[PDB]
Design a protein around this ligand. Sequence first.
Ligand SMILES: [Cl-]
Ligand SMILES: [Cl-]
Lengths: 386, 386
Amino acid sequence: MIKLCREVWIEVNLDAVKKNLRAIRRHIPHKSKIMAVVKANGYGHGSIEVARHALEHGASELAVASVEEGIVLRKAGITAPILVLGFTSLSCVKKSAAWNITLSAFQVDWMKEANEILEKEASANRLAIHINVDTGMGRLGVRTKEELLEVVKALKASKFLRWTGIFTHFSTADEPDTTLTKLQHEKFISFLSFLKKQGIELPTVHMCNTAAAIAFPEFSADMIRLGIGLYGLYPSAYIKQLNLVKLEPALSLKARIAYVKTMRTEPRTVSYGATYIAEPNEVIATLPIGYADGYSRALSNRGFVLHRGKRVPVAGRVTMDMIMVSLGENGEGKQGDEVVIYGKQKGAEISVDEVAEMLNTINYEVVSTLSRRIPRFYIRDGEIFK
Amino acid sequence: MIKLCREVWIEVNLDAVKKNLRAIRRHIPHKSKIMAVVKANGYGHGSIEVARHALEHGASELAVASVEEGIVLRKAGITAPILVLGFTSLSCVKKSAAWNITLSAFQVDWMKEANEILEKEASANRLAIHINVDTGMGRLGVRTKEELLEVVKALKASKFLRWTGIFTHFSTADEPDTTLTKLQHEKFISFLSFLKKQGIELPTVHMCNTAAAIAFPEFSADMIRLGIGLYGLYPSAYIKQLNLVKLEPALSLKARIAYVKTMRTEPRTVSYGATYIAEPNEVIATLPIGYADGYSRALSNRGFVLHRGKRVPVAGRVTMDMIMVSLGENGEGKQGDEVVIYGKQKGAEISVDEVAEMLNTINYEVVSTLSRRIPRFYIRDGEIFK
Ligand SMILES: [Cl-]
Ligand SMILES: [Cl-]
């Protein structure tokens, strides 16, 4: 089946991504479109194949972190609209207009100089722009209704720019306390009511992330931005509890056993620092994955893997390329057996959310730090490719 | 100068690498060679440019973690010997011989099957082999002198394999207690001599790592394997104490400020969870780096960066692609200023050892988990390229 020189890989199940998209479509209003977020190599899953599938099954537009990440998508043949969520330097204004990438802006002087650059070169293309309004996140965006109007005034006087959206971001929509979420919404609405009482037409309006699409579908306005929900992961345990929508996890991580031996001769120390000493009838197995792959060293003498449907412990310290596990006295196993690191095997499961708890972080970090030297295989209609 | 759409990057100083190899060459015996270890994408530094440069200034062989990492070096132009340190699957025996990668091996049965595959194929490609002897690490390799004799005969009968080395690995040579390191050395020296009593002639012997070579230079034998010391960093605080060799770190990490504002309007919340509230006078600057780049989320409300020669702190949680830092009341800063994340600025420093200490890990892991989505630039002789 799968053939590798070093035997470790990732499996990503696209049939699961498709069911996550259907669950979200039925729950939100029909007038509202879906923009799929695939920044940071598709939250670790691989960005090319997941953007392709998503656009075949419900998404209309895409979001990324930087001009460079959008260029990898256009090079694979994707023609849909693509919005950059971070800040972009004026260095890349000409390049973004040529690959037809949409950028966010919120400054009167950036607006002005962006227009000049494309003016002084004639340019048949018009750069599309989305305005970001800061109602409580404190990261980027415009902050008062009077200076938002200067920006609207300026963007309108720019013949080489095109206004195609306006948006904001919720900073606590995954927590039981809904105080601040209700306040940001109130502020955002009054700024567009301000702009509307002057003859200004509004383009596409969007505010919801995964959690706010599930708890407040009445905020869906024109469009939502589906992020961690697309990969089948819940933004918090509280949003998982309201039992409103059913998601399925897309990703598992596997490998094959490299060597087996019984610890009969001395010494019987195991790994750097000699932090674990074996028994003379103990069986010890060696796997090809390490902390340079993204398997945290903090799981030394702590975490597990699944061999033959059993949980088994890491023995000693994690190293850069390999880990060691214990099979017990007279344990059972062969060079070449299959092991599951994140995922499900026979009747067992080690979930991404468990490993995240064990390390005191959130599931976003676990998946999106898995290295690119590990190959990703895709399963669609129960079969393999790439 | 440095022109990017998203403004974050790494710099590798290759004049540092050259000085670090000079120091080592002048510590060990003149009759010993140096094998340079560049696995895991050169410990996060880039494998192609560091190997190219190390082969020109003192090294003669190279080591990697897998066949795939070796082939990237052949495709870049390199004709030096390349040894794979982990376990290689029998289904890559034919590719290794074709690209001329040296494989590690330690089982009688692996040897014969690898010989039969090359017999049914011809091609003047004999596959070269190093034998791994386990003396206390417990990871890979053979563990009794009677077993080692069987494998040396199975190999000397095999007409298409070629025997070019034998090695071992020390698990505690960076610690001040030398007990277990001397035990391992006694075990290895005896096994070698039992082969001599039988009339067997020996190839290249190697056993030392960076700490082993600084601390026990008289264990050098034919060859050493220089890894972490290549990049200007010490194996342990203890080996820095001895004060025997002077190393200079080769890597730093930088970005440019994306936005600056005063928190006059309300509300004054910052980042996810609203874990931080600002004064009506406070200045907040936004930076393009996040945990998907390898900047740990455990640095929320804890870490530092250098801006104009002074440390300023992270404010709020780290997010996937951006962080916020407080410039204080009063303020002082503009869009486009240069910030140092790891390294030096004026007479100030945030070293990689310092950050690994703050996160309860080792410098090995801080460098080699830096994402391939950050671009790398190289300095050689005071000038920049890629
Ligand atoms: Cl934002
Ligand atoms: Cl080993």
